[PDB]
Amino acid sequence: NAVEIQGVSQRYGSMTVLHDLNLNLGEGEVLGLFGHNGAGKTTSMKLILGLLSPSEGQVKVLGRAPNDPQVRRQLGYLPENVTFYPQLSGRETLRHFARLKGAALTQVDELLEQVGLAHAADRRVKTYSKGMRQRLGLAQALLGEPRLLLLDEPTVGLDPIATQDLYLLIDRLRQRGTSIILCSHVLPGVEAHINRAAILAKGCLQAVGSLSQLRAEAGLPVRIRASGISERDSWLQRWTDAGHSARGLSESSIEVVAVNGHKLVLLRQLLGEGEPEDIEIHQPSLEDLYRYYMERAGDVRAQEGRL
């Protein structure tokens, strides 16, 4: 139990911008915090880092207080956008953070080669791209064996080979036993790497659990499309007999929204008559699950192209 948030309802200005979130996090899970209308996403983020005081509730990070110096050497925080110090170099920025966090100075030379920055080491940070600063910002987060990462959108401004390799670097640290929090807004793509999502909206933590549980606690249609063939006399009707609307949008894009309660007989309908080519069972993704829980609290569905 790495992050033990219990009963916290943070109020400031008598506004109550957070209310009653009970967020226990295990020692190896990859939690995700996603916020829209609610300001809870940032306040709870702060609350774990120890730079905010929990009014009416207790925050226990790593079994201890969140602002203790003994746990702050074991934390790692990647903020949103950090243009660090434009006149310093790459090594001198990381040697500065190595002296503060108490890490050994031999880790700096093996983190500027672990992250792809040894070619751009000893070069000034004003001559860095946005992707190179996110690479450097991750490099101070892995400094001195952190048992709890806390990444606030680590994959912005980053080329797609490094983003896929970042989550492989994240997946090495899950096996090492370090709990990671991925606070993001780029929800398609992060759902393959998190273990448990935590969608919080209007302060109240709406839903928590794994991706298999969030699809179980929310009846959502699976978007099965069957290329090979769309064509129309029996493929419009052989699925609508039990209430599955075989709606298509192209030459063969019949996205039959099912109910996830008849997956044996519909695929036996699919493979028993008519030959298919490539079925794409598109499960309700983290984008679709997010808009269910958001709409279930306060949100009303926007119009056809109106946001």
Contact set with a copy of itself (CB under 8 A)? 34, 36, 81, 113-116, 130, 155-166, 168-169, 171-173, 185-189, 191-192, 212, 215, 227, 260, 263-264, 267-268, 271, 275-281, 283, 287, 290-291, 294, 299, 302, 304-307
Residue 300 binds which of a copy of itself, other proteins, none (CB < 5-8 A, kind-dependent)? none
Among 55, 83, 237, 240, binds other proteins (CB under 8 A): 83
Query: Which residues partner with 207 through β-bridges?
Result: 199
Consult the annotation and say whether 40 binds a ligand: yes
Terminal alpha carbon distance of the chain? 40
Q: Which residues in 91-110 contact other proteins (CB under 8 A)?
A: 92, 96-97, 99-102
Consult the annotation and say whether 35 binds a ligand: yes
Of 78 and 205, nearer to other proteins (C-beta) is: 78
Among 17, 39, 88, 279, binds other proteins (CB under 8 A): 88
Among 7, 27, 56, 82, binds other proteins (CB under 8 A): 82
Of 80 and 110, nearer to other proteins (C-beta) is: 80
Consult the annotation and say whether 39 binds a ligand: yes
Q: What is the CA radius of gyration of the chain?
A: 23
Q: How many residues bind other proteins (CB under 8 A)?
A: 25
CB of 259 to a copy of itself, least distance (A): 12
Binding mask 125-154 for other proteins (x = CB under 8 A): ---------------x--------------
114: region left, alpha or beta (phi > 0 left; psi from -120 to 50 alpha)? alpha
Consult the annotation and say whether 42 binds a ligand: yes
- Residue 185: HSE in the Cβ half-sphere, 13 Å Cα cutoff: 7
Of 136 and 201, nearer to other proteins (C-beta) is: 136
Consult the annotation and say whether 189 binds a ligand: no
Strands 246-247 and 278-282: unpaired
| Binding-site residue set for ATP | 35-42
The residues binding other proteins (CB under 8 A) are 49-51, 69, 72-73, 75, 77, 79-85, 87-88, 92, 96-97, 99-102, 140
